[PDB]
Write a protein that binds this DNA or RNA. Structure first.
Lengths: 340, 554, 95, 95, 554, 340
DNA sequence: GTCGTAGCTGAGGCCTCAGCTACGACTTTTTGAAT
DNA sequence: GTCGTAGCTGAGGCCTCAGCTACGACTTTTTGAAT
């Protein structure tokens, strides 16, 4: 690597440039430094301040200043008019037309997604009292499917196999609840992913998936990448086809994990849902309680992209995106995906 | 497979109206507002945006008055969000709100909305209901117009579902309507470009006069090096030294340009972001440092085509030939029409015109980009060598052009500085216009990307340099916008006082909002609109929709 | 084509008055003690009447919107006795 | 042919305000908190502008006179958000 | 002798403009305002109405800046009130203010004002001054336009003095201008009646469309028997039981009618008098008791002619023949066009039409007024006998006409009461219109004077009874203005409730303000304007200006 | 006679009808009665009140209610729509075309005017100290001129003789001042009656004449007479030709007398005038002081029209007008003019 | 040039009405547009 | 139904600004016109 994103949490903050350094001040009193050598995007939260000289020094070094709301809602980027990233974009577009590029990254993404799913099985299995362990036949089955995904011949075969394995994971997803079937929170193994959520658990799953997709979109656009040109999913109709491509490994870690957190912590209850002729949707208070929960899961630290330094998830996303652009253009072969 | 998402039934409503409209709005995002879309949103918002009762799963006997009900069936392939559902117990009926009067047609409902209501009716039938009817509740006169789900109405609906599916999977945008009266109000006529694409695709007609642009404002220029732009709700107050210099209404602002060390409070930046009002940071001298973006532009076909054609040599070569031939032709035309001599010099020397036309044609027959760049250099050299011929009837005091001083960093002439400022301040306009149409302003076919100068704005500005930049410089010097006192020396070179910068920027703005007549389509169009129209036509040309890009030679 | 609108209000609650003064500086320029002059095209007039149907309380407030003309020929239509009258001009802000 | 005029004032002296409220009830009908609607032909508009050039003090008052139209077609030109708007009708008083 | 007063020099200004205009304005008063006379008074008032310095009797050396200076010479025969006099010591110069822009004529001053300035110059020369010049100070652009007293300018002035003297002594009003563009704005075109007098005096043209009336309001009707009309400055508030029922703007009020025991505060009466707004007192049932007058009408030629012709038998006879022949013709026309039968009755019986036309012609050949009254009685008897034929397609409940119940004091039918009210409320309109043109409404040629019914309004209303009174009754009954419930019985007969009286009066007002097309001149004219036009034409006919009175047969 | 005008001076007043009576009330307290038998015009001053029932009872009996301002300024009449007065108007117009009507009334008016002039000579002669009496040669001369006016042949001869005699009266008008020539108030014997007043005394004379003409106009119009159709003067140009005809006897009594009053009482002084190149005009304060003086002369009582009952002048005018209409239509021959 | 701006409180200035006490206008004849 | 109405004083209600203290919006995908 080269450097790391700097997150200016303090809404009080005032950021100046000190020669080769970026100085954070609080009330005319210093807080911390970045110093532009190991820097990446500078993320400014609500009503922080960035002196225009510091902004110009960021732009000249082609650093994607990003503006988040006070809470952390994304509001826009600020990119420089230099070839720093157009090289990355042209590499992405030139290489998306290739069969091994699409196929190889798709195989890696799917094997990582499956591995995260089975690791989450062995983490959060709550068939407690009599089945402390998941059926190792299931674990062997998912291992076999993982090898199959390693050696899928083409994209459509991989899509079919992916759908299969994800379904057989969701077969025991309800096995991971507070210990039994969640009567009042029913989970359907088959009505997955239809546009209106027909189950409360599926409503949570879809909402978490949408927020994860948004996070991945903004992280991808922070680096010089076009989120709407995917390698595995399909591009048009307004679908972010690269966020959808890359969020696959992170579905169990941030979406399934957030739902499990908020349902095993009693944050989400049967009274929070409204059902209408085939649609189960959250209530506003429940919606933003769940948004707070999604934050709390996005705030956790995990240590091992390939270098062990305990990043928050929201920065691990950028680390992965930079790793992707770095795989492209031929720095590091085969995009070392993040798997736990 | 996932080759196609579920068709929203509003796109089903649009497809039976204009298949190209459905393609634009659904397969490429690409929406824009006008009088009527805004008015319709205003009607729907105050009542049906907010939810109401649920459609009971177990229905025995009670009034159903659900509002904004979201269904979908994936056997059918459609998704809907019904405006309202009126049902007694187990016999429900969709109700769709509209905006205007009852139309003057048999049955009181046009073909599209009837199809939308029938589609929502089928969706309700899917979830275990008996609909066999619907209504259109026009908000303006609240004259509920019933619609009965006749059989071949359902035939039309399913046919339209299949037709939209096939036209989306094919990947070819259907042609525009033939001289229809629908188009002058479809709120995408500025993006469909119906008559222009008809005319250039050799379905030749005479392009009807510009369906004029609507609901777009003018830029905000912040040239003072000690300004402080802060938010004051919806206005945007620019205070300098703690006194309100001017206010800018955000509804009427279309861009923001921050020159030099002008500060923009983070709240003002957020408010600009919430409206996608582009904000562009520039050096004190006009260098284009950076701008603001927001998670890309949802149109992907445009960028995919742009890059895929960028990787094709002769497409790049043909485009570059067109561009610099247009540039040389415009240089010739400017040299003619604004040459100001006294006698035996008052009209252009034909030897120069011979050289310039021969260079035009030598470029038209160029073998590769190397020779093209060489010819562009030679022709621009001759043009600037004669450039001083024609301002104020000759050089004034200090207003001295040196033809050899062009094309490098610190301007050490007054008029060299003026030209460089105009160029670097037209590049911004082109970048904004190109990014507003879905293109990527940095991937260029002719130029190479380098800092501060996007490779595609530099390309498509080449025809427009003489018409906008050089013309603004000439008009500014001739009319007396700038005299020698306006400049200040510096170790670097020449620069302008603030009194000069404000006047020059005002002149450039007047040039951009100055109407012309298109050579090809022949209607009065402002230059700012013309940049957008040309960007859109480039998108169409790369799309393979039209045979060749219209270069705007005048 | 843009029109010149004159908007004059009576608001009987100081909070609603703040809300409306808010919105009106969003749209036009101050003219008189409770009057704004607005130069708007169609999209923006739709926006303004949308805003002032929820800012105000229809029971006891009163907002009046007058469409003088095509904003190019308004000067013969307006006669001011005290201060000068000068219509809103559509030009960029150079300062 | 008569026109519909809308007259709105800011008067900075209570005596002059009485004088002007005097005169304006002479000419039109109350519309808003400081606005009158007047339906006048040419002779009477000349009279009104003659009166309000001597009622008011040109230094600091402000009176605005808007000529909406031919008083038969004014209804499309006026949109009221609170109370109803109803133009002055030219008919005798029977009561 | 005193055969002629001193000519005011403004009348000298008018005479060179239109000799008929000078005759009207000087020899008969007869002034009226429009846009421009009012505007000119407004210009002159704020400055030159108030006096200034005196023209010094002993002048040696000092600035003379006199304003509104009143001179006259009786050797010349003129009198003037000079707008201003600018003079250095002993060389003075008249200055006349105007209202508009500089005219677009050679010398910047039209023929009239030049003559006025020369006349004032001669007057100044008379009192021992050296003028030899003048000016016209247009107030709008204050572009002083000098005028030099050229010699034949003085020739014109003295010629005009002699011409006005002779035309005043002759006693014959000069003819109108021939289709001039001066007339459509001379502010007496409503009194000159140029095109009408041209057309009827056989200088035959096609009358140009009515130069429309301006600056006149609508009546005030006070029908409530417990109303209290009081002054509130310029408004006129009618309060009933101490609550403001309605306000009436005095600038927009043209008459006042006080029905029954409605009180009018003395201050309101004074304010009405100050504007010559006629006030008419009526009984509760419409009987015309009295009205208000003010020191006669300054036109004497009109009344002198009226009386002198009234003392002539065959003039009375010809007028009466015309009038009742017009009445019978209008009765026939009404009977036709509004007959409402069912079948074999749905169109008029020709035997009745034979009788009515034969009576028309028997009256046209009448020997004296006795036989004329007999024929009028017989024809009206037949007309009313068939009157019930044609309302609501037949009599309703209680809405019963008795043809024998007409022409006497207490109405004992509903429709008889309605007719009597309409007649007695049209007589007021005719009286006001006739008194507003200088005539004397009580000296009639046909009818004899008796209380409550002026002899001339009763005369000239005879053609208009079927068109206004009977038509209003018919339209009121047919449209459902009045049904049987609206009436209340009484020992006297039938009367109307207040709800009935207000609706009926509103209907009559709508009839009066309802446009028609004149048979002779063919332009759209309201009935109220038509009454004034007819009164004026009667004045002209008595004046001997036109051959015969146009009776308005339709 | 039949009856007399009722003058309601009290602005407080409220007038009702009591059967056959017209009752004046002040503050719900009675003041006086008229009783409609001997009534004539009812004159209401500023903001008096006349109940509409009383107004209707006046109209039915055809009584010309007249409205005066608080001071006494005329503001309008209120006549009834009956033939009461149109008979008088038609008699006036039918009889104005006659030669003896015009000539005879003109002779009477002129002889009365001359007689009033010479009586005012013998009244107000102030050649005091040495000439207590006017020259009886002048008195004999005016007597002779009076006989000549009695036997004038035609109207133009009467006009010439009238002008002569009035001139020779004005020759000694200045003899009637505070005792001598009024230096500072000069009187011109010859510049009489030119439209602008060239002398202060002539300014007073013209203003008094104009006010007397107005009073006569309103008095004539109160009765059913057309003031604008004269027997002796000429009708057109807006001149009131009957006020001008009838004010001739009253010129010495109300105009000359008022000027003499206001100049021998010091009310009018040389400082009250402004002179301009041939015009001597009063000042505003002086104008309305003189108006008050004209009132005071109009308020005096004189007793003998033909019936001795001490009427005020403003009612003597109506008595004379009624006498005129009564001469017309043939009640009383030869119009018994008022001469003192 | 320190988070910046949305939102609320005071103090003054417009705008009208209900309720009181003064009052007690009116001025000669001319001028006043239009093409 | 007592002079009636013009003109002035109070008490309350609109309308805006300067000066203070809280705060810390942003939410899946659809819908949205026109003839």
């Amino acid at each position: 690597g080269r450097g790391l994103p700097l997150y200016v949490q303090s809404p009080k903050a005032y950021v100046r440039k000190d020669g080769d350094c970026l100085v954070i001040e609080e009330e005319r009193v210093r807080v911390a430094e970045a110093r532009l050598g190991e820097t990446s995007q500078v993320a400014l939260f609500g009503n922080a301040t960035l002196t225009t000289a510091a902004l110009h020094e960021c732009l000249r070094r082609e650093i994607p200043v990003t503006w988040l709301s006070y809470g952390g809602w994304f509001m826009g980027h600020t990119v420089s008019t230099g070839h720093r990233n157009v090289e990355t974009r042209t590499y992405q577009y030139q290489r998306s037309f290739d069969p091994e590029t699409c196929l190889n990254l798709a195989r890696r993404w799917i094997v990582a997604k499956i591995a995260n799913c089975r690791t989450l099985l062995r983490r959060n299995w709550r068939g407690e009292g009599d089945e402390a362990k998941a059926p190792p036949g299931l674990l062997m089955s998912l291992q076999d499917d993982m090898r199959h995904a390693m050696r899928a011949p083409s994209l459509e075969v991989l899509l079919g196999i992916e759908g299969a394995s994800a379904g057989r994971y969701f077969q025991h997803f309800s096995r991971m609840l507070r210990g039994g079937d969640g009567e009042g929170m029913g989970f359907d193994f088959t009505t997955r992913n239809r546009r209106p959520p027909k189950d409360p658990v599926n409503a949570l799953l879809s909402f978490a998936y949408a927020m994860l997709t948004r996070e991945w979109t903004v992280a991808l656009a922070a680096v010089g990448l076009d989120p709407y040109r995917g390698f595995y999913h399909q591009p048009r109709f307004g679908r972010p086809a690269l966020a959808l491509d890359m969020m696959e490994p992170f579905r169990p870690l941030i979406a399934d994990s957030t739902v499990l957190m908020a349902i095993n912590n009693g944050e989400i209850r049967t009274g929070d849902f409204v059902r209408s002729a085939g649609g189960c949707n959250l209530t506003d208070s429940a919606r933003k309680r769940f948004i707070a929960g999604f934050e709390r899961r996005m705030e956790q630290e995990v240590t091992h992209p390939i270098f062990k330094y305990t990043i928050s998830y929201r920065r691990l996303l950028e680390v992965q995106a930079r790793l992707l652009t770095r795989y492209l253009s031929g720095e590091i072969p085969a995009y070392p995906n993040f798997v736990t | 497979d996932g080759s196609i998402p579920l068709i929203p039934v509003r796109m089903l409503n649009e497809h039976v109206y204009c298949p190209r409209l459905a393609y634009l709005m659904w397969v490429q995002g690409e929406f824009s507002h006008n009088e009527f879309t805004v008015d319709g949103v205003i009607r729907h918002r105050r009542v049906d945006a907010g939810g109401g009762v649920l459609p009971s799963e177990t229905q025995e006997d009670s009034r159903i008055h659900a509002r904004s009900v979201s269904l979908s069936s994936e056997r059918l392939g459609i998704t809907a969000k019904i405006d309202l559902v009126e049902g007694e117990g187990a016999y429900v009926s969709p109700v769709d709100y509209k905006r205007g009067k009852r139309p003057h047609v048999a049955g009181g409902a046009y073909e599209p909305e009837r199809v939308q209501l029938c589609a929502q009716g089928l969706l309700l039938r899917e979830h275990g209901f008996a609909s066999d009817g619907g209504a259109l509740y026009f908000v303006a006169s609240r004259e509920r117009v019933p619609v009965a789900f006749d059989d071949e109405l359902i035939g039309r609906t399913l046919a339209a579902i299949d037709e939209m599916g096939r036209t989306a999977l094919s990947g070819t945008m259907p042609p525009p309507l033939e001289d229809s009266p629908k188009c002058p109000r479809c709120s995408l006529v500025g993006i469909c470009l119906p008559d222009e694409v008809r005319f250039l695709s050799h379905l030749s007609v005479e392009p009807r006069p510009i369906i004029p642009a609507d609901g777009r404002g003018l830029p905000l220029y912040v040239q003072s090096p000690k300004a402080y732009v802060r938010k004051d709700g919806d206005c945007l107050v620019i205070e300098e030294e703690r006194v309100r210099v001017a206010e800018a209404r955000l509804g009427e602002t279309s861009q923001v340009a921050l020159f030099g060390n002008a500060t923009l409070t983070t709240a003002a930046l957020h408010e600009c972001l919430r409206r996608e009002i582009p904000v562009t940071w520039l050096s004190y001298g006009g260098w284009f440092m950076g701008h603001t973006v927001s998670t890309g532009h949802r149109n992907v076909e445009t960028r995919t085509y742009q890059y895929q054609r960028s990787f094709d040599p002769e497409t790049c070569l043909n485009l570059a030939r067109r561009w610099i031939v247009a540039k040389i032709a415009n240089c010739r035309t400017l040299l003619r029409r604004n040459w100001r001599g006294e006698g035996d010099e008052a009209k252009a020397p034909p030897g120069l015109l011979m050289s310039l036309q021969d260079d035009m044609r030598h470029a038209m027959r160029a073998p590769s980009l190397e020779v093209l760049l060489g010819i562009e250099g030679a022709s621009a050299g001759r043009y600037f060598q004669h450039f001083s011929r024609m301002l104020r009837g000759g050089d004034g005091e200090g207003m001295g052009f040196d033809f050899t001083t062009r094309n490098r960093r610190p301007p050490k002439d007054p008029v060299n500085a003026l030209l460089s400022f105009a160029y670097a301040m037209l590049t911004r306009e082109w970048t904004v216009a190109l990014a507003a149409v879905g293109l990527d302003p940095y991937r260029g076919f002719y130029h190479q990307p380098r800092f501060g100068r996007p490779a595609l704005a530099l390309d498509m500005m080449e025809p427009f340099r003489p018409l906008i930049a050089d013309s603004t410089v000439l008009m500014a010097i001739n009319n007396g916008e700038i005299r020698t006192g306006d400049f200040v020396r510096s170790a670097g070179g020449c620069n302008l006082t603030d009194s000069a910068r404000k006047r020059f920027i005002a002149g450039f703005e007047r040039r951009m909002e100055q109407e012309v007549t298109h050579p090809i389509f022949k209607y009065t169009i402002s230059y700012r609109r013309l940049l957008e129209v040309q960007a859109r036509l480039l998108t169409r040309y790369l799309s393979g929709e039209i045979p060749a890009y219209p270069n705007f030679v005048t | 084509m843009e029109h010149l609108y004159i908007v004059s209000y009576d608001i009987r609650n100081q909070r609603r008055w703040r809300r409306l003064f808010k919105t009106m500086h969003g749209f036009g320029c101050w003219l008189q003690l409770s009057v704004f002059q607005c130069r708007l095209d169609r999209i923006r007039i739709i926006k303004m009447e949308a805003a002032i149907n929820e800012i105000v309380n229809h029971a006891e407030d009163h907002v009046l919107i007058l469409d003088l003309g095509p904003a190019e020929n308004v000067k013969p239509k307006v006669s001011s006795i005290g201060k000068t009258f000068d219509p809103i001009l559509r030009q960029a802000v150079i300062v």
